[PDB]
Amino acid sequence: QTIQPGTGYNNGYFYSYWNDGHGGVTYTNGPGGQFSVNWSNSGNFVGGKGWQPGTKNKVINFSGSYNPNGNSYLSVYGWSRNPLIEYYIVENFGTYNPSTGATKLGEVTSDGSVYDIYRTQRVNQPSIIGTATFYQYWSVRRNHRSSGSVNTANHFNAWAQQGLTLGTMDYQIVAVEGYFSSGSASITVS
């Protein structure tokens, strides 16, 4: 169903939908691991389905239509505690590369493409544990796609070789994020 921001479980999967209050975004939970998002002149939002808690070796499958009209990303997104980390394994994006301004740590090959790895620090920003300071890890896919399989272990292992050591995994979802743009997406996670 079309819902206001919140989290929960729907048809077997965890979901999380958040927006900045700006308006212009419609999020709908669909059958199985499907979710749909339609936006027009939105603010900043994030919505998707997956698991709570996630794991360090989950192989995530996703398929569907992803049609961004401007700034947006389609990624495997989640958090870790001890250390507190917000991470993204970006599979596709619109007009803006999300790693812009981040520090490149290295590269990793996974699921048919090389990914560039970055890190950035968020100081006194909102998090799953409240206002805090933490790193944001990024794996950005070179060959954009809207369907496929993501072997999270390859990314976590690559990040570990670069110094990151994830601790307790919190939620882990396939998410569509939008940043003051428009677009449509219908994604199914499994």
Curated annotation (Swiss-Prot):
Induction: Induced by D-xylose, dependent on the cellulase and xylanase regulator xyr1. Repressed by glucose through negative regulation by the crabon catabolite repressor cre1.
Family: Belongs to the glycosyl hydrolase 11 (cellulase G) family.
Description of pH dependence: Optimum pH is 4.5-5.5. Stable from pH 3.0 to 8.5 at room temperature and from pH 4.0 to 7.5 at 40 degrees Celsius.
Residues annotated as glycosylated: 38, 61
Record's keyword annotation contains Ligase: no
Chain's role: Glycoside hydrolase involved in the hydrolysis of xylan, a major plant cell wall hemicellulose made up of 1,4-beta-linked D-xylopyranose residues. Catalyzes the endohydrolysis of the main-chain 1,4-beta-glycosidic bonds connecting the xylose subunits yielding various xylooligosaccharides and xylose. The catalysis proceeds by a double-displacement reaction mechanism with a putative covalent glycosyl-enzyme intermediate, with retention of the anomeric configuration. Produces xylobiose and xylose as the main degradation products.
GO BP of this protein: xylan catabolic process
Active site annotation, chain numbering: 86 (nucleophile), 177 (proton donor)
Enzyme class: hydrolase
Keyword Hydrolase: yes
GH11 domain span: 2-189
Subcellular location(s) per record: Secreted
Name this protein carries in UniProt: Endo-1,4-beta-xylanase 2
GO molecular function, one term: endo-1,4-beta-xylanase activity
Catalytic activity: Endohydrolysis of (1->4)-beta-D-xylosidic linkages in xylans
Amino-acid positions noted as binding substrate in the UniProt annotation, renumbered to this chain: 73, 77, 88, 122, 126, 136, 171
Main location: secreted
GO terms for cellular component: extracellular region
Keywords, comma-separated and alphabetical: Carbohydrate metabolism, Glycoprotein, Glycosidase, Hydrolase, Polysaccharide degradation, Pyrrolidone carboxylic acid, Secreted, Signal, Xylan degradation
EC number assigned by the record: 3.2.1.8
Pathway assigned to this chain's UniProt record: Glycan degradation; xylan degradation
